[PDB]
C-alpha cells in the first residue's frame, strides 16, 4: 500500500531551567522507529522498532550527529524566533518541525513535506513543489528570506526526493512483515441502556494497524455524523490501535442502526449490528 516516513522534531525552551530540550522521533506510517532526546543522560539516537536494530554503528552515529547539531541549531532558532516576535526572555516557546516523504502503492514518491510551527501555530512550510516557502507571518518571512538566501529549499528537496525515499523503502523492506502488514480491526457492538427509552450502541474496533480507520453509524442507511460520539483513535501499546463510535438510540430501534467499518486489513468492509 502507500507509506510514509516522518520525523517530528520538538524544541522547547525553558528559561531558568537550562537550555532548550530537543527531541526527535522518526516514524514509518504509525510505527515509531527511532528517538533522540537531548535531555537523555547520554543523548544518542536509539532504536524504537526491532527492524531498525540491524542498522550498523555508522547509521546510529550519523543520526546522532544530525540530532546533536540540530539540538544546537534549534536553540539558536528559538532565540531567533523570540526576537522575531519581540518576546520576553521569560517565556517558554516551542518550535516543531515535521517532515518526510510519502510513497504511493508503487513505491514512487507521491510528495514531500517539511512543515514548521512555533508555539503550535503554523510558521513556515515547504510548498509541495519543494522549491518555495509559505510563511505564516512577517516573522516567518524573516526565516523564509534567510532560507532563500541559504538555498535551504534545495537541501530539503534533495533529501525528500533522495535519501528520504531511499531509506523509507529500505525500512519498508526490512520491516516488511509488520510495516507492510495491515491488521484488521476486531469488531463488536455493545448495548447499554441509558434509560427506559434509549440505549447506547457502541461499535468497537480493536487491534488494527495502521491507525487509519473509518467507523460510522448509520440509521436506516443514513450516516449519523452529528449523533455519533467518535473517540480519537488510540494506541493499544502493542502497535495496534483502537477506536469506538457510539450512538444513543430509541429503545426498540436498535436494528435500524448499522456500524460500518472500513480498514486496510479487512478483506471487505464490515457492516455490523447489535446482536442481542
Amino acid at each position: 500500500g502507500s507509506h510514509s516516513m516522518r520525523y517530528f522534531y520538538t524544541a522547547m525552551s525553558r528559561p531558568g531551567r537550562g537550555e532548550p530540550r530537543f527531541i526527535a522521533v522518526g516514524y514509518v506510517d504509525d510505527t515509531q522507529f527511532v528517538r533522540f532526546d537531548s535531555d537523555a543522560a547520554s543523548p544518542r539516537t536509539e532504536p524504537r522498532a526491532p527492524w531498525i536494530e540491524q542498522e550498523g554503528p555508522e547509521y546510529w552515529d550519523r543520526n546522532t550527529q544530525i540530532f546533536k547539531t540540530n539540538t544546537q541549531t534549534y536553540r539558536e532558532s528559538l532565540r531567533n524566533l523570540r526576537g522575531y516576535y519581540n518576546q520576553s526572555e521569560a517565556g517558554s516557546h516551542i518550535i516543531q518541525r515535521m517532515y518526510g516523504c510519502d510513497l504511493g502503492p508503487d513505491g514512487r514518491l507521491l510528495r514531500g513535506h517539511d512543515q514548521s510551527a512555533y508555539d503550535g501555530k503554523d510558521y513556515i512550510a515547504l510548498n509541495e513543489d519543494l522549491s518555495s516557502w509559505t510563511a505564516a507571518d512577517t516573522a516567518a518571512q524573516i526565516t523564509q528570506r534567510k532560507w532563500e538566501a541559504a538555498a535551504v529549499a534545495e537541501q530539503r528537496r534533495a533529501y525528500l526526493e533522495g535519501l528520504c525515499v531511499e531509506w523509507l523503502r529500505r525500512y519498508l523492506e526490512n520491516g516488511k512483515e509488520t510495516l507492510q502488514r495491515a491488521d484488521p480491526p476486531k469488531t463488536h457492538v455493545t448495548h447499554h441502556p441509558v434509560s427506559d427509552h434509549e440505549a447506547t450502541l457502541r461499535c468497537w474496533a480493536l487491534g488494527f494497524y495502521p491507525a487509519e480507520i473509518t467507523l460510522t453509524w448509520q440509521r436506516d442507511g443514513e450516516d449519523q455524523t452529528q449523533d455519533t460520539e467518535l473517540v480519537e483513535t488510540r494506541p493499544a501499546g502493542d502497535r495496534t490501535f483502537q477506536k469506538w463510535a457510539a450512538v444513543v438510540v430509541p429503545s426498540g430501534e436498535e436494528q435500524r442502526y448499522t456500524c460500518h467499518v472500513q480498514h486496510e486489513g479487512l478483506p471487505k468492509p464490515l457492516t455490523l449490528r447489535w446482536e442481542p
Binding site: 520525523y7 526527535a24 522518526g26 547509521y59 550519523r62 543520526n63 550527529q65 544530525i66 540530532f67 547539531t69 540540530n70 541549531t73 534549534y74 539558536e76 532558532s77 531567533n80 524566533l81 518550535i95 517532515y99 514548521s116 510558521y123 513556515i124 526565516t143 534567510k146 532560507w147 541559504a150 535551504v152 537541501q155 530539503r156 533529501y159 535519501l163 528520504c164 531511499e166 531509506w167
Partner: peptide
C-alpha cells in the same frame, strides 16, 4: 534516516 546535515552551516530559523 533524517535529513542529513548540509555541507556548510546548518541554517537556523
Amino acid at each position: 534516516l533524517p535529513e542529513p546535515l548540509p555541507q556548510g552551516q546548518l541554517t537556523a530559523y
